[PDB]
Amino acid sequence: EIQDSEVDIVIAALQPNLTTFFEAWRPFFSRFHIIVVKDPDMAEELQIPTGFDLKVYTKSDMGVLGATSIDFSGHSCRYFGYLVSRKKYVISIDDNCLPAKDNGGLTVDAVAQHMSNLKTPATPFFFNTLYDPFRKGADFVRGYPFSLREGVECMLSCGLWLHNADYDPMTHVVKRNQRNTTYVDAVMTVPLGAMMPVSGINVAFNREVLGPVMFPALRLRKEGKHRWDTLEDVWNGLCAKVVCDRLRYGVKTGLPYVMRSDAEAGKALESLKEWEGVKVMDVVLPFFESLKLSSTSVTVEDCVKELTSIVKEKLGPQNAIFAKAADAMEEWTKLWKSHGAQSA
Amino acid sequence: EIQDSEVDIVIAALQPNLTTFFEAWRPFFSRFHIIVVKDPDMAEELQIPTGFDLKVYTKSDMGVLGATSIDFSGHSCRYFGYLVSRKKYVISIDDNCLPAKDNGGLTVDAVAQHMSNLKTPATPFFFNTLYDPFRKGADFVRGYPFSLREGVECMLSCGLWLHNADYDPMTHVVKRNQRNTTYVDAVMTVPLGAMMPVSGINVAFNREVLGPVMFPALRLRKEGKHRWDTLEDVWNGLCAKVVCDRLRYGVKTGLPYVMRSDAEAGKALESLKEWEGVKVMDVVLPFFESLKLSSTSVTVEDCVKELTSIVKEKLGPQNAIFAKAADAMEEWTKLWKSHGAQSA
Numbered sequence: 001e002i003q004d005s006e007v008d009i010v011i012a013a014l015q016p017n018l019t020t021f022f023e024a025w026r027p028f029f030s031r032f033h034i035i036v037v038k039d040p041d042m043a044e045e046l047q048i049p050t051g052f053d054l055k056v057y058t059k060s061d062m063g064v065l066g067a068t069s070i071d072f073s074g075h076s077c078r079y080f081g082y083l084v085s086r087k088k089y090v091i092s093i094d095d096n097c098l099p100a101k102d103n104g105g106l107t108v109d110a111v112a113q114h115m116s117n118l119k120t121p122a123t124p125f126f127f128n129t130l131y132d133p134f135r136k137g138a139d140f141v142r143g144y145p146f147s148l149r150e151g152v153e154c155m156l157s158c159g160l161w162l163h164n165a166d167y168d169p170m171t172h173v174v175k176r177n178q179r180n181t182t183y184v185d186a187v188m189t190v191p192l193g194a195m196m197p198v199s200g201i202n203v204a205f206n207r208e209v210l211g212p213v214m215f216p217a218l219r220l221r222k223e224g225k226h227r228w229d230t231l232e233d234v235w236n237g238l239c240a241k242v243v244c245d246r247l248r249y250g251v252k253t254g255l256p257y258v259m260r261s262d263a264e265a266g267k268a269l270e271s272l273k274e275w276e277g278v279k280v281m282d283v284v285l286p287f288f289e290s291l292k293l294s295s296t297s298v299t300v301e302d303c304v305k306e307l308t309s310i311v312k313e314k315l316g317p318q319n320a321i322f323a324k325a326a327d328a329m330e331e332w333t334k335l336w337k338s339h340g341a342q343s344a
Numbered sequence: 345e346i347q348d349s350e351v352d353i354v355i356a357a358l359q360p361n362l363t364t365f366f367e368a369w370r371p372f373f374s375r376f377h378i379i380v381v382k383d384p385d386m387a388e389e390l391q392i393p394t395g396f397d398l399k400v401y402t403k404s405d406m407g408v409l410g411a412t413s414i415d416f417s418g419h420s421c422r423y424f425g426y427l428v429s430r431k432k433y434v435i436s437i438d439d440n441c442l443p444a445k446d447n448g449g450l451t452v453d454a455v456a457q458h459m460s461n462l463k464t465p466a467t468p469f470f471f472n473t474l475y476d477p478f479r480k481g482a483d484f485v486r487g488y489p490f491s492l493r494e495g496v497e498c499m500l501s502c503g504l505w506l507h508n509a510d511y512d513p514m515t516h517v518v519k520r521n522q523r524n525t526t527y528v529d530a531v532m533t534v535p536l537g538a539m540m541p542v543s544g545i546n547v548a549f550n551r552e553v554l555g556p557v558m559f560p561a562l563r564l565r566k567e568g569k570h571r572w573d574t575l576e577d578v579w580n581g582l583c584a585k586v587v588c589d590r591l592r593y594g595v596k597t598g599l600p601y602v603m604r605s606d607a608e609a610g611k612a613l614e615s616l617k618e619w620e621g622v623k624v625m626d627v628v629l630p631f632f633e634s635l636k637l638s639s640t641s642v643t644v645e646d647c648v649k650e651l652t653s654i655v656k657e658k659l660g661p662q663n664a665i666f667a668k669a670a671d672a673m674e675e676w677t678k679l680w681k682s683h684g685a686q687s688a
Contacts, residue, residue, distance in 0.1 A: 103447060126629070127540040129504060129597050130524065137526045139519065142512040142571065143541030143578035145625035160473065168486040175483065180474070182481040184530040194535035196471035197487035227486065234487030253473050281489040285470070 002119045006088040007111070008207070009034040010081035014074065014225050015095050016044040023049060024098050028109045032091075035081035039225075040073040057084065067335060069327045074223075075200065075230055076216035082207060083335060086344035089118065090211075091204040094227070097258040100162055103183050110256035113187075114157050114204035121151030122189040122250025131188040131254070151189070154250040155209050156240060159202040160184075161260040166199045169228035169272040179262075187254035192245050195288055198237025201227055202258045205240075209249070211340050212304050213240045215332035217325035220276060226263060228271045231280060235325075238288050243303045246293055280321070287315055304333055346463050350432040352551070353455070354379045354425030358418065358569055359439045360388040367393055368442045372455045376435075379425040385417045385567060401428065409679070413671045418567050419544060419574055420560040423676075426551060427684045433462060434555075435548040437602060438571070444506050444601035447527050454600035457531075458501045458548035465495025466533040466594020475532040476596070482530075495533075499554050499593040500584060503546035504528070505604040510543045513572035513616035516607075523606075531598035536589050539632055542581030545571060546602045549584075552688035553593070556648050557584045559676035561669035565618055570607065572615040575624060579669065582632050587647045590637045624665070631659055644688075648677055 009032045015021075018036075022029065033053045038046055040059035048054065062072060062080060072080060075094075082090055091114050100108040120134045126148050130138045133149070140149055165180040172178075190196050205214070218235040227233075244251050297306040312326035353376045359365070362380075366373065370393075377397045382390055384403040392398065406416050406424055416424055419438075426434055435458050444452045464478045470492050474482040477493075484493055509524035516522075534540050549558065558580050568574035588595055635654065641647045652673040660667035 125539075125633075127534055127538050127597070129502065129541060129543065130509065130526075131528065135526075137522075137524055139509070139511055139515055139522060141541050141543070142510045142515075142621075143543075143575060143581070143625060144512075145629040146622055147626045147629065158473070165474065165483070166486045167483055168488075171483055171486075178481070178483060180481055182479075182529060184475065184528060185526055186528045186530060190471055191535050191538035193537055194471050195469070197473060197485050199473065199485065231487055237487075253471075277487075278490055281487055282491050285489040285492070289469075 002089065002115050004031060007032050007115065008081070008085045008087040008090055009111075010078060010085065010090050010092045011036045012039070012075060012078035012094050013037060013042070013046050014039050016042060017047045018095055019047060019049050021095050021098070022052065028099065028111045032111070033087070035085055037077045037081050039077050057081070065335065065339065067331060069324070069331045070216060071219065071222060072216065074219070074225055075227070076219060076232065079214060079216040082211050082214055083340045085207055086342070088206060088208050089204060090207045093202050093258055094200070097161065097202060097260050100257040100259040103185065108256050110159060110202065110258055113256035114159065117157035117187055117252045117255075118154045118204065118206070120154065122154040122252055123148065123151045124189050124192040124245070124250050127191055131186045135187065152248055152250045154252050155244055156198070156205040156251045157203065158198050158253050159256045159258060160254060161199070161202055162257050164260040164262045166201055166227060166260075168277060169268045169275050170278070172228070172268045173272055183257060184254065187252055190241070190251045190253055196237060196241060196253065197234045198240065199227075200233025200236070201260065202256070208342065209300060210240050210243070212300050212333060212336045213243050215329050217328035217332070218321055220280070220321065221274065224271060226267060226271055228268065228275060231277050234281075235284070238284070239307060242288065242291055242293070243300060246297070246303055247300070283318060290314070301333065304329065308333070346433060346459050348375055351376050351455070351459065352379055352429040352431035352434050353377065354381070354422060354429055354434045354436050355439065356381050356383065356419055356422035356425075357390055357439055358383050358386065360386060361391045362439055363391050363393055365439050365442070366396070369437075370395070372443065372453050376455065377431070379429055381421045381425050383418060383421050401425065409683070411675065411679070413668070413675045414560050415563055416560065418569055419571070420563070420576060422544075423558065423560045426555055426558055427679060429551060430686055432550060432552055433459070433548060434551045436544070438545045441505070441546060441602035441604050444603045446601070447529065452600045454503060454546065454602055457600035458503065461501035461531060461596045461599070462498050462548065462550070464498060466498040466596055467492065467495050468533050468536045468594045471535055475530040475598070479531065496592050496594050498533070498596050499588055500542070500549045500595040501547065502542045502595070502597045503600045503602065504598060505543070505545055506601050508604040508606045510545055510571060512621065513570075513612050513619045514622065516572065516612045517616050527601060528598060531596055534585070534595045534597055539582060539629070540585060540595070540597065541578050542585075543571070544577030545604060546600070552686055553644055554584050554587070555684060556644050556677060556680045557587055559673055561672040561676070562665055564620060564624060564665060568615070570611060570615055572612065572619060575621055578625075579628070582628065583651060586632065586635060586637060586651065587644060590641060590647055591644070627659070627662060648673070652677065
C-alpha cells in the first residue's frame with residue numbers, strides 16, 4: 001500500500017540534454033522527488049529545465065566509498081540512486097523514453113500505473129486467464145481457487161515499451177524496420193518459478209526489499225550506452241525473481257507502456273560487433289534452472305548471501321564477467337548494509 | 345503445421361435452436377467438418393441450418409458406447425465428439441458464444457486464430473514479455489536465451505471471452521452487471537508448472553495427443569447446464585497441464601475472443617444455491633501444487649495412467665466426486681484405447 005511521498009523518480013542521464021525528456025514527463029513527474037545521476041563518463045553536463053525536486057549526483061560524490069570491484073559508468077550509474085535514496089519505492093526509466101499513447105489516444109501516466117501495480121496484490125500461484133483480477137473489467141475466472149484470491153504484495157513492477165522495443169541488437173539490425181505498435185492493455189503476475197527478462201528500461205520496485213539484489217554486475221564491457229550493450233538488468237531480474245519466489249512475494253509485468261524513442265543511425269551494428277550476449281544467456285539459463293535453493297535462507301540478505309556462493313562456485317570459473325560479478329554482488333551487499341540501509 | 349482438412353469443429357448443443365448461432369459462425373465454420381452433439385437430457389430437436397458438413401450425434405449414438413461410469417449429459421456430451429472425431433485438431437466452442445469484435449471493429453475468425461496458435465511454437469521455459477514472439481510486431485526480448493527460441497509444440501489453445509465472461513456463479517451474482525470489455529490483443533504461453541483455469545467455452549487442442557486427458561470427470565452436480573455449475577473442464581485443465589509440463593509441450597492463452605451471449609435472468613442464483621465449487625477448488629489446488637509426475641513417464645498414456653492412480657490414491661477418499669472421477673478417468677483411458685485412438 002502506497003502514498004506518493006514514498007516514491008523516488010530515479011533517472012539515468014546518458015544524454016545530457018534532458019529538456020525534451022523532462023518537459024514531456026513533467027505533468028507526471030513533477031509532484032515527486034527525482035534522483036537524476038550523471039554518467040561518470042559524460043563529457044558534458046545535464047541541461048535540465050528546472051521546477052522539479054532534483055537531487056542530482058555525479059561521479060565524484062560516489063567516492064564516499066571506493067567500491068573497489070564495481071564500475072558505475074553508463075547504465076550502472078542508475079544504481080547509485082537506489083543507494084542514496086531513503087524512500088520505500090523506486091520508479092525508474094531511462095532518459096530516452098517518453099510518455100506513451102494509449103489506444104484511445106490518452107497519455108499514459110506510467111508513474112500512476114506503477115504505483116497501482118505495487119499496492120495491488122499479485123497472483124503468482126495461479127494464472128488468472130483474464131489477467132489482473134483487480135483491474136476494472138477484470139475479475140477472478142471460474143476455477144481460480146478461493147484460498148488464493150488475496151495475493152501476496154507486489155515487490156517489483158516492470159512495464160513495457162512502444163516503438164523502439166527492447167530487442168537485442170542482433171534482432172534489431174536483422175529485422176530492419178520492426179517497431180512495436182501493439183498496445184496490449186494488460187498487467188499480469190509472472191507465475192511462481194517462471195523466469196523472465198526484466199527490462200531495466202521501465203521498472204519500479206520496493207527499494208527497502210529488493211535494493212539488495214539490484215546489484216550493478218555482469219556488464220559486458222566498459223563502453224556502451226544503449227541497452228543493447230549490457231545484460232545486467234536481465235541478470236538482476238533473474239536474481240530478484242528467484243528471491244521473490246523463495247519468499248512468496250510477487251512480480252508484475254505489462255502496463256504501463258512508455259514510448260522509447262529511436263536510435264542514432266547504425267549504432268545497432270556498431271554495438272552488435274562487440275555483443276557477446278548470445279553465448280552468455282544460454283549458459284546463464286541452465287544456471288538459473290539449476291538454482292533450486294537450500295531451505296535456510298529466509299531474509300532477503302540470506303538469499304543474496306546464499307546466491308553469491310552458488311554463483312561464484314558454479315559460474316565463477318566459466319568467465320571473467322561472472323566471478324567479477326559475484327565479487328560485485330558481495331561488494332554491493334556491503335554497500336547496502338553501509339549506505340543503502342534505512343534511516344529516513 | 346496445419347491445414348483446414350485436419351480440423352474438426354466439435355460442438356455441444358444444450359440450446360435446441362442453433363440457427364442464430366451457426367448463421368453467425370458460418371463464414372468461419374463452413375469450410376470445416378462440424379460434429380454437433382445433442383445433449384442426452386435434451387428432449388426437443390436441433391434446428392441447425394443447412395450448408396454444413398455435419399454429423400450430428402445423439403443419445404442413441406451415445407448409448408452404444410455402453411459407458412458404465414461416464415455421464416454424458418450437459419456439457420459432458422462434448423467429450424463424445426472428441427472420441428468419435430477422427431481428425432488431428434478439435435476446435436470447440438459453446439452454443440452460447442458468437443464471434444467477437446476486436447478494437448478495429450473486425451470480427452475475430454477464432455477458428456483461424458486457434459489454428460494459428462497451434463501452428464506457432466510455444467515458449468513455456470522463459471517469459472517473453474512481448475508475449476507470443478511469433479505474432480507480428482512481437483519478437484524475442486533482449487535477454488531471451490537463444491536455444492529457447494525453438495519453441496516446443498503447442499498442444500492447447502484456450503481463448504477468452506467478451507461480455508458474459510467465465511466468472512463463477514458466486515462472483516456473477518454478487519458483482520452484478522460486470523461484463524468483460526477489455527480486448528487484450530495478445531496471446532501468450534503459460535509458463536512451465538503454472539496452474540491455470542482452462543475455460544471449456546472457447547478452446548482447441550491436438551486430439552491425438554491430449555485427447556486421452558480431456559475426459560468427462562468431476563461432475564459436481566447432476567446437471568450443470570451453465571458453465572457456472574461445472575468444473576469438469578477446469579479438471580481437464582489441471583490434468584492436461586501437468587501432462588504438457590511432463591512431456592515438454594506448450595499451452596497458450598489469450599486470443600481469440602468470442603462474444604459470450606448473456607445469461608437467462610436470475611439463473612445465476614439458481615446455480616449458485618447449489619455450487620459447492622467453493623471448497624472443491626481449495627482441495628484440488630494443493631493436490632496439484634504437490635503433484636510431480638515420474639520422469640519415467642514419456643507418453644501421454646504413461647501420464648494419464650500415473651495421474652489417475654494418484655487421484656485414486658490421494659484424492660479418492662476425500663470426496664465421492666474424486667474417486668468417481670478417477671473411475672471415469674480410468675474408463676475413458678480404455679475408451680480411448682478401444683474407441684478413440686489414431687496415429688498416436
